[PDB]
Design a binder for these strands. Structure first.
Lengths: 47, 43, 112, 120, 89
RNA sequence: ACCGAUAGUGAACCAGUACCGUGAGGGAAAGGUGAAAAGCACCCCGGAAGGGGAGUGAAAUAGAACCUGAAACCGUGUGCU
RNA sequence: UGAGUAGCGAAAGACGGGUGAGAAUCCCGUCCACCGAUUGACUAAGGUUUCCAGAGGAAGGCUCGUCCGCUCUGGGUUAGU
């Protein structure tokens, strides 16, 4: 129930391949200038 | 669970008091020993 | 030219602030600002304040156009770590690490 | 149906509270999950109010709480009276709808998608 | 004697409210009783004392960056006059 | 032909002191800006912290301030794969 | 390194206003609920300023904080019974 051998920098960096965030929708607004989330409440309300 | 060392003002000064240490010969040695070391608190 | 802004002693683990720094690396100032206002993290608000300061320095000290800037570099180094303690099962005590971070952003127009 | 991470009684109590709070100001802001559960509870209350018969009154008093609304010119009235009053008059030609949901941004404390439920 | 017994007067929001009537607060020595206080305040301001209240104060601990220490013991005293006043500018 | 801050006294600094034990008793860690504070007026981003300029200085050396290696460790960018 | 993994130790909360750079967590209001021979009200042992007000949470309080029985800066305890 305890690590038999210490993990190296290669194996440790290989396990963190899918560990990341993803860019959101960010729908353009028709009259505001700033961006907004899709299907949200603002000046764009999606597109 | 009932632990040890029950705080008590009276008893504390009636066992480790300065007058109690100056009532015997062995107790006097303790004071002399602590004084030699340079302890701030004698009792 | 090139303009930069750094934030020292930022109370936030460097491994958590390096996840939001891989979303605005090589993007435009406009896009970057929009991506930081849509990201749901505890570093976005702090990183957004640093990026804003970097743009102001390039429009005042260098008087460059802020409508054609591009995030060149963006990384986070480690800083002084604080040592804390919390009790365990018996009379043992585990150790806690409160690491900090040194966020840095270099904005440029891509011209010598 | 949803359980909203609560007990049978606790869930039944919360639902009654939300419904009464959505008839006092007619514009409350909460989470999405709770907004998709109180939307099918306040809609049934309005249907009872449209009837206007004694039976419905007693059936509408098994969910609505006991509160005191304050209108203009120092005017007071219980939620039940308001439900069988202006509210009933407003929706009399519309068959269905009543409530409406509007999505918003996430919260700060936790990543909970907050929304806004109001009466059309 | 009858001059070192009283150190200085006390001016606070509580004394001001107690100054409405014939009642004044003074900082006396930490070795004198009430009798001496009443036999030393009516001989310096030439007034008539009705009663005197005394209360002790334990030393308060202080600090200012790697600097421990305590304050000095204080002995408050509230004197009540039967007729007269005190010019406490 | 003693030591030079893990050395030399336990103690070069806040030492028999933080702390630990009912008590006798046990007992640490911690030195260095510059020749002279001349210790960053003033402007900009920001709630602030922090930064970018501008200034003093032979040099920011800027109040986690001589030099600042690693077994370390943590990153960003690139030539071959 | 194990790893963004185990854990985050007592009652049921709902919404509306308010303040603020920032609010699931602070303040006010209306509902709702729990203890109910006690998570109530006293006195003693013990602790020793934790008590009150106005400023700050920059560190600490297992998350957040404009506050946390709460930590950093002013004041408070009156006896012939």
């Amino acid at each position: 129930a305890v690590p038999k051998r210490r993990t190296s920098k290669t194996r440790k960096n290989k396990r963190r391949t899918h560990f990341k965030i993803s860019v959101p929708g960010m729908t353009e607004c028709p009259n505001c200038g700033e961006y907004k989330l899709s299907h949200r409440v603002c000046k764009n309300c999606g597109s | 669970v009932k632990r040890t060392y029950q705080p008590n003002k009276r008893k504390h000064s009636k066992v480790h008091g300065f007058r109690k240490r100056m009532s015997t010969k062995n107790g006097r040695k303790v004071l002399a020993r602590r004084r030699r070391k340079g302890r701030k608190v004698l009792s | 030219m090139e303009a930069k802004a750094v934030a020292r002693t930022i109370r936030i683990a460097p491994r958590k602030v390096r996840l939001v720094l891989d979303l605005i690396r090589g993007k435009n100032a406009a896009e970057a600002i929009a991506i930081l206002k849509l990201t749901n993290k505890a570093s976005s608000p702090v990183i957004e304040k640093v990026l804003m300061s970097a743009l102001a320095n390039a429009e005042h000290n260098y008087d460059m156009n802020t409508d054609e800037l591009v995030v060149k570099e963006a990384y986070a180094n480690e800083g002084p770590t604080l040592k804390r303690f919390r009790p365990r099962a018996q009379g043992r005590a585990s150790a806690i690490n409160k690491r900090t971070s040194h966020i840095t952003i270099v904005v440029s127009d891509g011209k010598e | 149906y949803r359980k909203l991470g609560r007990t049978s009684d606790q869930r039944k109590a919360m639902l009654r509270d939300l419904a009464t709070s959505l008839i006092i100001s007619e514009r409350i802001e909460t989470t999405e999950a709770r907004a998709k559960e109180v939307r099918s509870v306040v809609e049934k209350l309005i249907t009872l109010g449209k009837k206007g018969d004694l039976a419905s009154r007693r059936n509408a008093a098994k969910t609505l709480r006991n509160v005191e609304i304050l209108n203009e010119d120092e005017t007071t009235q219980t939620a039940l009276q308001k439900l069988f009053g202006e509210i009933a008059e407003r929706y009399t030609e519309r068959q269905g709808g009543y409530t409406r949901i509007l999505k918003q941004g996430p919260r700060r404390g936790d990543g909970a998608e907050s929304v806004i439920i109001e009466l059309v | 004697e009858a001059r070192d017994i009283l150190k200085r007067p006390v001016i606070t929001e509580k004394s001001s409210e107690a100054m409405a009537e014939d009642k004044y607060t003074f900082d006396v020595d930490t070795r004198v009783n009430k009798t001496q206080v009443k036999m030393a305040v009516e001989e310096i301001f030439n007034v008539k004392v009705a009663s005197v209240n005394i209360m002790n104060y334990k030393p308060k601990k202080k600090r200012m960056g790697r600097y421990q220490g305590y304050t000095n013991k204080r002995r408050k005293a509230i004197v009540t006059l039967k007729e007269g006043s005190i010019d406490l500018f």
